[PDB]
Structure formats: structure tokens, C-alpha cells
Design a protein around this nucleic acid. Structure first.
Length: 129
RNA sequence: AUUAAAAGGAAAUUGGGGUGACAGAAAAUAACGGGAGAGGUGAAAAUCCAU
């Protein structure tokens, strides 16, 4: 059920607590292989280390070239609804790992959601102490 | 029986001043992809997960 070189999309959602390496078809409805940081480490604190993000992104690519997807439209995103809109630590490691993995890199975009207007944020008035 | 006060009141623009009748985030629901973790912390656990 594989084909020749088919462009993919890599919605790499990496936050301060975890990382996600998700590749689908260009329609965005059928995923190809999705490996996250928590599937590559045993320590909870290391669910989003750059080594964890790069190792996961490494093994993700091998399946992509195995199935024929070689080029990826990267999409960068962090947990930025009402929280921090900056991509987490392992975001760059995951992208670079794919680049070292001999994958053509197409468009790169930031798909972190930006609320036109927002709900309440957790923490109350005085915030986190 | 004085005037016409850089006293006051009365008859071209400025105004997120007051009243009255477009946007996606967050979450839910529906359906599809995938099949093992996900949240969370300085570190963990109670928690959600093969329905």
C-alpha cells in the first residue's frame, strides 16, 4: 500500500512537557507514523529532551522513506492557546533530526494557534507561585 | 434710564462618551486516520486511555 515519493506534512507539536512527531498525507486526514517523546524514554522528566525528540524523529523518518514519503511540509506548533506560544525545547531537535535523516524539507510554517480572543487562563488573579 | 467682562447662558468638526438591533482560540459533539501511551511536576503521584 506504498507508493513513490509522496510529499508529507510534519506537524511537529513539541511542548515543554512532551514532543510529537506526526506525519500524514497532504490532506491531513491519514497519518503515516506518529512517534512521541514519551514512547522513546523511561524517565518522565525526559519526555521532551532534545535527544528524545531527535531519536523519535529519527525513527519516524525511516518509516517514511520505507513507505515512500521523503519530503515533508513542516508545521511548527506549541501549546499556545492561552499558554506560551513559543515552541518547546525539542522542536528544533526534531526538525533537524529529520534534516539529518536525509529528508527534503518543503514549506516550514508556525501553526501555533493565536486566539483572536481568549477564554480565561488557569491560575487566578495572582498567577503561579 | 450705561456697556457687551480671556464672567456666564442660548442658535464646522472631534469623541475605545451612552443606549438599541465579524473572528477564531478553548471545550463539546459527529465522522475518518493510527494503535500506546497522555496530562503534570524540580521530581512524582491521584487522573484520562484498547469501549
Amino acid at each position: 500500500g506504498s507508493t513513490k515519493d509522496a510529499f508529507g506534512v510534519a506537524h511537529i507539536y513539541a511542548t515543554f512537557n512532551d514532543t510529537f512527531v506526526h506525519v500524514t498525507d497532504i490532506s491531513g486526514k491519514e497519518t503515516i507514523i506518529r512517534i512521541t517523546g514519551g514512547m522513546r524514554v523511561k524517565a518522565d522528566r525526559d519526555e521532551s529532551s532534545p535527544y528524545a525528540a531527535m531519536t523519535a524523529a529519527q525513527d519516524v523518518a525511516k518509516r517514511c522513506k520505507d513507505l515512500g514519503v521523503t519530503s515533508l511540509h513542516i508545521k511548527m506548533r506549541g501549546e499556545g492557546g492561552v499558554y506560551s506560544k513559543t515552541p518547546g525545547p525539542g522542536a528544533q531537535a526534531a526538525l533537524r533530526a529529520l534534516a539529518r535523516a536525509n529528508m527534503k524539507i518543503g514549506r516550514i510554517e508556525d501553526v501555533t494557534p493565536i486566539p483572536t480572543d481568549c477564554t480565561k487562563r488557569k491560575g487566578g488573579r495572582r498567577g503561579r507561585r
